[PDB]
Amino acid sequence: DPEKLKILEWIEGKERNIRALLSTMHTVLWAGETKWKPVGMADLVTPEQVKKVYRKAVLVVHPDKATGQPYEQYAKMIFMELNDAWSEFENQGQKPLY
């Protein structure tokens, strides 16, 4: 399906980059999603900011909440990528943007 390709294209280039994924995730969310709000790089400076934004993203694409939904598969792909990116962020010392 189309949507799935849009997701792969999205992942391509940003793999394991948490800030890159969060700041553009609104470009891949499914239609109808209301909780999430576009986020820019200026809101992902401090580690605290990132974690806060990551936490809100994970709740929006959480699998257990998507089980039985048309976007279930999409939420899972996004979920994994976010968690892997966070894990990577930790392995980097969670360095501030500047």
From Swiss-Prot:
Q: What is the effect of changing D64A?
A: Loss of interaction with HSPA8
In its record, the post-translational modification comment is: The N-terminus is blocked.
What residue stretch is flagged as signal peptide? none
Tissue expression as described in the entry: Brain.
Domain J: from-to ranges? 34-98
Quote the subcellular location field of this record.
Cytoplasmic vesicle, Clathrin-coated vesicle
Function field: May act as a protein phosphatase and/or a lipid phosphatase. Co-chaperone that recruits HSPA8/HSC70 to clathrin-coated vesicles (CCVs) and promotes the ATP-dependent dissociation of clathrin from CCVs and participates in clathrin-mediated endocytosis of synaptic vesicles and their recycling and also in intracellular trafficking. Firstly, binds tightly to the clathrin cages, at a ratio of one DNAJC6 per clathrin triskelion.
| The protein's assembly and partners | Forms a complex composed of HSPA8, CLTC and DNAJC6. Interacts with HSPA8/HSC70 in an ATP-dependent manner; this interaction stimulates the HSPA8's ATPase activity. Interacts with CLTC; this interaction produces a local change in heavy-chain contacts, creating a detectable global distortion of the clathrin coat. Interacts with AP2A2. Interacts with DNM1(GTP-bound form); this interaction allows clathrin-coated vesicle (CCV) formation at the plasma membrane.
Domain comment text? The J domain mediates interaction with HSPA8/HSC70 and is required for basket dissociation.
The entry's protein name is Auxilin
Q: Which gene encodes it?
A: DNAJC6
- Give from-to of the shown chain within the full protein: 813 to 910 of 910
